[PDB]
Structure formats: C-alpha cells, structure tokens
Design an enzyme around this catalytic site. Structure first.
Site, PDB file in Angstrom:
ATOM      1  N   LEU A  12       0.824  -1.204   0.000  1.00 49.63           N
ATOM      2  CA  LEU A  12       0.000   0.000   0.000  1.00 49.63           C
ATOM      3  C   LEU A  12       0.860   1.256   0.000  1.00 49.63           C
ATOM      4  CD1 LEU A  12      -2.892  -0.891   2.482  1.00 49.63           C
ATOM      5  CD2 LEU A  12      -2.983  -0.764  -0.013  1.00 49.63           C
ATOM      6  N   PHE A  17      10.308   4.411   7.456  1.00 54.67           N
ATOM      7  CA  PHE A  17       9.366   4.143   8.524  1.00 54.67           C
ATOM      8  C   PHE A  17       8.874   2.699   8.483  1.00 54.67           C
ATOM      9  N   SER A  19       6.924  -0.722   5.748  1.00 57.60           N
ATOM     10  CA  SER A  19       6.208  -1.186   4.578  1.00 57.60           C
ATOM     11  C   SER A  19       4.853  -1.722   5.009  1.00 57.60           C
ATOM     12  CB  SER A  19       7.014  -2.274   3.881  1.00 57.60           C
ATOM     13  OG  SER A  19       8.362  -1.864   3.728  1.00 57.60           O
ATOM     14  N   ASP A 135       2.648  13.737  15.194  1.00 59.73           N
ATOM     15  CA  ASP A 135       2.765  13.862  13.740  1.00 59.73           C
ATOM     16  C   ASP A 135       1.389  13.968  13.091  1.00 59.73           C
ATOM     17  OD1 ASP A 135       4.175  14.160  11.348  1.00 59.73           O
ATOM     18  OD2 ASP A 135       4.278  11.994  10.969  1.00 59.73           O
TER      19      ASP A 135
HETATM   20  O1  LIG Z   1      -1.604   2.201  10.214  1.00 65.53           O
HETATM   21  C1  LIG Z   1      -1.047   2.545   9.183  1.00 65.53           C
HETATM   22  N1  LIG Z   1      -1.618   2.404   7.961  1.00 65.53           N
HETATM   23  C2  LIG Z   1      -2.892   1.845   7.747  1.00 65.53           C
HETATM   24  C3  LIG Z   1      -3.635   1.142   8.630  1.00 65.53           C
HETATM   25  N2  LIG Z   1      -4.825   0.762   8.049  1.00 65.53           N
HETATM   26  C4  LIG Z   1      -4.876   1.217   6.756  1.00 65.53           C
HETATM   27  N3  LIG Z   1      -5.801   1.107   5.813  1.00 65.53           N
HETATM   28  C5  LIG Z   1      -5.634   1.642   4.625  1.00 65.53           C
HETATM   29  C6  LIG Z   1      -4.477   2.343   4.278  1.00 65.53           C
HETATM   30  C7  LIG Z   1      -4.343   2.923   2.913  1.00 65.53           C
HETATM   31  C8  LIG Z   1      -3.665   4.131   2.760  1.00 65.53           C
HETATM   32  C9  LIG Z   1      -3.518   4.695   1.507  1.00 65.53           C
HETATM   33  C10 LIG Z   1      -4.043   4.071   0.390  1.00 65.53           C
HETATM   34  C11 LIG Z   1      -4.717   2.874   0.526  1.00 65.53           C
HETATM   35  C12 LIG Z   1      -4.874   2.291   1.773  1.00 65.53           C
HETATM   36  F1  LIG Z   1      -5.545   1.116   1.839  1.00 65.53           F
HETATM   37  C13 LIG Z   1      -3.466   2.493   5.239  1.00 65.53           C
HETATM   38  C14 LIG Z   1      -3.672   1.915   6.500  1.00 65.53           C
HETATM   39  C15 LIG Z   1       0.283   3.140   9.297  1.00 65.53           C
HETATM   40  C16 LIG Z   1       0.971   3.383  10.498  1.00 65.53           C
HETATM   41  N4  LIG Z   1       2.123   3.923  10.216  1.00 65.53           N
HETATM   42  N5  LIG Z   1       2.254   4.055   8.831  1.00 65.53           N
HETATM   43  C17 LIG Z   1       3.267   4.550   8.055  1.00 65.53           C
HETATM   44  C18 LIG Z   1       3.116   4.549   6.712  1.00 65.53           C
HETATM   45  C19 LIG Z   1       1.930   4.039   6.144  1.00 65.53           C
HETATM   46  N6  LIG Z   1       1.788   4.041   4.770  1.00 65.53           N
HETATM   47  C20 LIG Z   1       0.470   4.174   4.148  1.00 65.53           C
HETATM   48  C21 LIG Z   1       0.443   5.568   3.527  1.00 65.53           C
HETATM   49  C22 LIG Z   1       0.160   5.495   2.019  1.00 65.53           C
HETATM   50  C23 LIG Z   1       0.208   6.917   1.470  1.00 65.53           C
HETATM   51  N7  LIG Z   1      -0.854   7.685   2.121  1.00 65.53           N
HETATM   52  C24 LIG Z   1      -0.643   7.798   3.576  1.00 65.53           C
HETATM   53  C25 LIG Z   1      -0.619   6.415   4.230  1.00 65.53           C
HETATM   54  F2  LIG Z   1      -0.268   6.554   5.548  1.00 65.53           F
HETATM   55  N8  LIG Z   1       0.963   3.572   6.918  1.00 65.53           N
HETATM   56  C26 LIG Z   1       1.113   3.568   8.246  1.00 65.53           C
END
Ligand SMILES: O=C(Nc1c[nH]c2ncc(-c3ccccc3F)cc12)c1cnn2ccc(NC[C@H]3CCNC[C@@H]3F)nc12
Length: 273
Positions: A12, A17, A19, A135
C-alpha cells in the site's frame, strides 16, 4: 502464524518508517493492513505490561486501541528475527486526507468543520489514553468514505504524554511549532494544537501555510483561499507564536466556527457519496 493467519495483498505504501501491505484475515475475511518495521530502524522502544521489549509504536497503539473508532486499531502484532509486524484495521473503501484534499482542492468549510471536529475527538482520545501522537497531518488521517469517519494512523513518532518538556522531535517539520524550531523544546498539548492549526489551514486552503523555518518563526498567516472570518480566527489562535497563547482543546471545540458540526454519516451523504 503469520502467513497462515493472513493472506497478504498489494503493497500500500512505504517509507524508511516501514512497509504496509493490504491483507485479509483468513477466517474473517476481515480487511487488515500489515505493517512491517525493521528493528534496526526503530529509534525508541517501550515495555509491555507483561514485561517485554517492544517498539514504542506498539506500546502507544495498545493504549489507544480500545474501540473508539477515531483511531485505526491494532488487532495483533508479531516479533520476527529482524522486525516487528503489526496487524491494523483497514477501512474499505478508504482514502487518506492528503490525497482527498489534493483531488478536491480546498474543502468547503462545512466539510472541514466535520473533519476537523473528528480529528479533535481522536486526538482527545489519545491524550486521554496517555498518548501523544506528535505527527498530526493529512497523510496520517484516513477517511472511511462510506461512513464519513476519520481515523488517525502512524504512531511511529509518538510518545507517552507528559506535562514536562520534550526535547526530541521526529515528526513533520512543516507541522512543528516555532518553539521547537527556535529552542528544541515544546510541550505536548500546545505543540499538538499548533499542528492542528496547520492541518485546519491545509483543509480550507488546499496547502500548508509555512514552507520555511523563518516563516514558521514569523508566524504570519496569509490566506490563499476565501475563508470565513471565524475560521481565520480559529486558525490564527491555534497558530499563536507563544504556546501559552494557543487555545485548549475545550476552547477549540467551543469556538463559534466549530458549532453545529455534521454527524459523520451526514457528512458522507452530503460530501462523500
Ligand atoms: O496504520 C497505518 N496504515 C494503515 C492502517 N490501516 C490502513 N488502511 C488503509 C491504508 C491505505 C492508505 C492509503 C491508500 C490505501 C490504503 F488502503 C493504510 C492503512 C500506518 C501506520 N504507520 N504508517 C506509516 C506509513 C503508512 N503508509 C500508508 C500511507 C500510504 C500513502 N498515504 C498515507 C498512508 F499513511 N501507513 C502507516
């Protein structure tokens, strides 16, 4: 565990940080997100109630994941030889606030009011659970598009909440308060309110107010979109240079611009569906 319990889907997103993969819990098949984090990349660690060495992110997530839907909940976690794996809730369909604002441009104030209110409630929840996010920004907020509900993510820069000074910060600089830029010192709640001011401006203007350190330090807010006098005032209050001049959370939610908020479902029906 753990490939047995979940079927991994597409990547995703990624940073140093971590993946994050889309996933399904076999036996649910509940939508989840699977976050992997390398042990070498982990800066601060914490202790579990049972007495275990664990990334601070896990400690913070546990304290906040008790059923209030304003934060993405941690459902389970695993330690591997060189990493930790986090199983998180995954709303569907979903879009983060950054992409949402990017697509739509500046948000109508009724919509920004609803979104901002929910973020406030989520942050209040965290602070009540003894957790400081550190943040708060659009990229760290997910929108459950069907329910109109906002969810906080990424406690990777967080800390246990305290009443004394913080002298470390690893969140986003352009959301960081002038006292951090100038003195490498800030207190939790007032720093949070500053970042909320930045977030609110971004929502109703479609971009952040400051790009450079000197702009943050100067603290002059120029509006690049039409914004009501009420909203401008709240934003300016949140972005007061002196931390003690910023509103409390109660004061923000009692602000005239914050009255008569839409319910999440109403918000979805009017603005999202
Ligand atoms: O809990 C986190 N992410 C998530 C938990 N549940 C989700 N459901 C859908 C998505 C999601 C985000 C964006 C596009 C489609 C998606 F299904 C992310 C998460 C998380 C914690 N720290 N972290 C650090 C980076 C990251 N990356 C996902 C990024 C993608 C770009 N947009 C911001 C999002 F945080 N995610 C996380």
């Amino acid at each position: 565990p753990l490939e047995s319990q979940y079927q991994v889907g597409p990547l995703l997103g990624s940073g140093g940080f971590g993946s994050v993969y889309s996933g399904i819990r076999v036996s649910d098949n509940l939508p989840v997100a699977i976050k992997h984090v390398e042990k070498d990349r982990i800066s601060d660690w914490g202790e579990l109630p049972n007495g275990t060495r664990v990334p601070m992110e896990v400690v913070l997530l546990k304290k906040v994941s008790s059923g209030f839907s304003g934060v993405i909940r941690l459902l389970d976690w695993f330690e591997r030889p060189d990493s930790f794996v986090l199983i998180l809730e995954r709303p569907e369909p979903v879009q983060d606030l950054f992409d949402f604002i990017t697509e739509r441009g500046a948000l109508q104030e009724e919509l920004a009011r609803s979104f901002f209110w929910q973020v406030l409630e989520a942050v209040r929840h965290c602070h009540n659970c003894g957790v400081l996010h550190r943040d708060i920004k659009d990229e760290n907020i997910l929108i459950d598009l069907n329910r109109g509900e906002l969810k906080l993510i990424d406690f990777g820069s967080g800390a246990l909440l305290k009443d004394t000074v913080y002298t470390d910060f690893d969140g986003t600089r352009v959301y960081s308060p002038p006292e951090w830029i100038r003195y490498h010192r800030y207190h939790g709640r007032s720093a949070a309110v500053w970042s909320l001011g930045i977030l609110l401006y971004d929502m109703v203007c479609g971009d952040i107010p400051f790009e450079h350190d000197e702009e943050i330090i100067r603290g002059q807010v120029f509006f690049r979109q039409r914004v009501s006098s009420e909203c401008q005032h709240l934003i300016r209050w949140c972005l007061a240079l002196r931390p003690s001049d910023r509103p409390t959370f109660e004061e923000i939610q009692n602000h005239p611009w914050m009255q008569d908020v839409l319910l999440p479902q109403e918000t979805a029906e009017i603005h999202l569906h």
